[PDB]
Amino acid sequence: DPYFNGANGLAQKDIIIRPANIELDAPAWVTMDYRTGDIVSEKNMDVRRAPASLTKIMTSYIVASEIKAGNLSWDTMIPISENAASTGGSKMYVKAGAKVSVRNLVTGMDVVSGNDATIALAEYIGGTTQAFTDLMNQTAKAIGMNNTHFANPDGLPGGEQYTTAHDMALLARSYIYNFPEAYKVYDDKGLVWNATKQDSVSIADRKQCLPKFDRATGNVIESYTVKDLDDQAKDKCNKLFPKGDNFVLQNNRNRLLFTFDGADGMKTGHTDAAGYCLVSSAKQDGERFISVVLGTTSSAKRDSESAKLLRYALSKYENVLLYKANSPVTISADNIPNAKAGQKLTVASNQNIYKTVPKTYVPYLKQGIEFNPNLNAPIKTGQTVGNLVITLGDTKEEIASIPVVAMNNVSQK
């Protein structure tokens, strides 16, 4: 175009937007992608703080492992000791001398944070609660939680007791991966618990019948309140909600289940030493993130600040396979010193580069080979010659770096 001056200089290249460093007033947090393990946001992620009921995640972790290993099943009926039934704090209200299934006890532990249920599972798997705590600390070392020490199975304060946001994210990621069925329990909205029979009722079964409960005692007054029901569906309301049976009704106190779209976990906790804490996970279009927030001064901030982290990660990041393993990258070998002029050099790594990167970076990433600057011929097949490098645009800034190995031979002159 001869009727415009300086169009090439007037044209505006798109400006790459880096994700801004998020700011919360939580003393510690971490946000991690599930499939890559990459950390996209964190503060003080290795500072040791009190665990509170996040301890119950490890207890639930060990319960799932014993089920997967065949030493336990969801159907197994555990006796409730008087020690378990009488533990204070959050209860699911299991009675001493009763038998309760693993499925019910795990639901009480995960959804209601019941200490009596946690203690009942611990006594059964470990014998004593002390022995079970030792198993918790061994399992923590095996997962790689190197800054974590539990004093008991339920997170009640007392004794040496700590974890980190990074360690809790490692535990959660392992939980999602190894125990997907047990992890589904954390998405339960609440627990409808028949304390008389010592068994639960599906929340869906409650919404069908809509029973009437005495406000002051939890005793069922009416089995069904629905105006029109089938005679046989009416009797199933009468069997699941008898007349006079005592019921306890509790919601899952992870508010994110109700407010955050795609949130399916995980666990809350609160002591004076730990503050309000939340391990949470949200999935949106195949992309799952894990967030841990520790030490907030209120439950509302605990939920507010966790949602900010999950929304920030889910909307600004992306999983990309930057390098497919065993992919050749060939270049001319003439420039490398002491090399014969005829030959070429191919390099490759047996590893992938699968990384969580900002969405805004993706169209600007470039594969590059950074050779050892002192590389001269001869070089043998299987010799390490440098790194495969992912850079951002035409700059030298590196997003990923992986050592690369020689697939050819070069002969010196």
- 328-333's contacts with Cβ under 8 Å and 24+ in sequence apart are 328/407, 329/367, 329/369, 329/388, 329/404, 331/369, 333/377, 333/408, 333/410
Q: Which of residues 36-75 bind Cl ion (CB under 5 A)?
A: none
Amino acid 406 reads A
Among 19, 35, 187, 370, interactor with Cl ion by CB under 5 A: 35
CB-nearer residue toward Cl ion: 36 or 346:
36
Please identify, among the stretches 27-35, 108-116, 133-141, 219-227, the one whose residues bind Cl ion according to the rule CB under 5 A. Answer: 27-35
Catalytic residue among 41, 60, 65, 113: 113
CB-nearer residue toward Cl ion: 356 or 391:
356
267 labeled binding residue: yes
Catalytic residue among 56, 91, 308, 355: 56
Q: Give min distance, CB of 390 to Cl ion, in A.
A: 19
Q: Give min distance, CB of 45 to Cl ion, in A.
A: 19
CB-nearer residue toward Cl ion: 84 or 172:
172
CB-nearer residue toward Cl ion: 42 or 287:
287
Which H/E stretch holds residue 35? Answer: none
Please identify, among the stretches 16-24, 32-40, 147-155, 219-227, the one whose residues bind Cl ion according to the rule CB under 5 A. Answer: 32-40
Residue nearest to Cl ion (CB): 35
Would you call 56 a catalytic residue per the annotation?
yes
Would you call 301 a catalytic residue per the annotation?
no
Q: Is 173 in the site for Cl ion (CB under 5 A)?
A: no
Residue matched to tokens 């004794």: 159
Q: Give min distance, CB of 11 to Cl ion, in A.
A: 37
Please identify, among the stretches 31-39, 102-110, 226-234, 363-371, the one whose residues bind Cl ion according to the rule CB under 5 A. Answer: 31-39
CB-nearer residue toward Cl ion: 100 or 313:
313
| # residues near Cl ion by CB under 5 A | 4
CB-nearer residue toward Cl ion: 35 or 301:
35
Residue matched to tokens 């406000």: 215
Q: Give min distance, CB of 145 to Cl ion, in A.
A: 21
CB-nearer residue toward Cl ion: 35 or 95:
35
Helix residue ranges per DSSP H, 129-179: 129-143, 165-178
Q: Is 389 within 8 Å of 368 (Cβ atoms)?
A: yes
Rounded Cα gap, residues 5 and 18, in angstroms: 32
Q: Which of residues 280-319 bind Cl ion (CB under 5 A)?
A: 287-288
Would you call 234 a catalytic residue per the annotation?
no
Please identify, among the stretches 26-34, 121-129, 201-209, 308-316, the one whose residues bind Cl ion according to the rule CB under 5 A. Answer: 26-34
Rounded Cα gap, residues 197 and 94, in angstroms: 10
- Go through 342-351 and write b for each residue having 16 or more CB atoms within 10 A of its CB, e for each that does not: ebebebbbee
Q: Give min distance, CB of 310 to Cl ion, in A.
A: 12
Q: Give min distance, CB of 363 to Cl ion, in A.
A: 20
The site string for Cl ion over 232-271 (x = CB under 5 A, - otherwise) reads ----------------------------------------
**What does DSSP assign to residue 412?**
B
Rounded Cα gap, residues 270 and 113, in angstroms: 11
Q: Is 204 within 8 Å of 190 (Cβ atoms)?
A: no
Please identify, among the stretches 118-126, 250-258, 279-287, 320-328, the one whose residues bind Cl ion according to the rule CB under 5 A. Answer: 279-287
Distances in Å between the Cα of 318 and the Cα atoms of 42, 61, 174, 380 are 17, 28, 21, 37
Both tokens of residue 309?
């982290």
Q: Give min distance, CB of 311 to Cl ion, in A.
A: 15
- 275-278's contacts with Cβ under 8 Å and 24+ in sequence apart are 275/27, 275/49, 275/52, 276/301, 276/302, 277/51, 277/52, 277/53, 277/54, 277/302, 278/254, 278/302, 278/303, 278/306
Among 29, 34, 260, 317, interactor with Cl ion by CB under 5 A: 34
Q: Is 268 within 8 Å of 278 (Cβ atoms)?
A: yes
Catalytic residue among 41, 53, 280, 306: 53
Neighbour-count burial of 364, counting CB atoms closer than 10 A to its CB (0-12 exposed, 13-18 middle, 19+ buried): middle
Residue 131: CB atoms within 10 Å: 13
Residue 153: CB atoms within 10 Å: 28
The residue ranges that bind Cl ion (CB under 5 A) are 34-35, 287-288
Which residues carry a binding-site annotation?
A: 267
Just list the catalytic residues.
Answer: 53, 56, 113
Q: Which residues contribute to the annotated binding site for substrate? A: 267
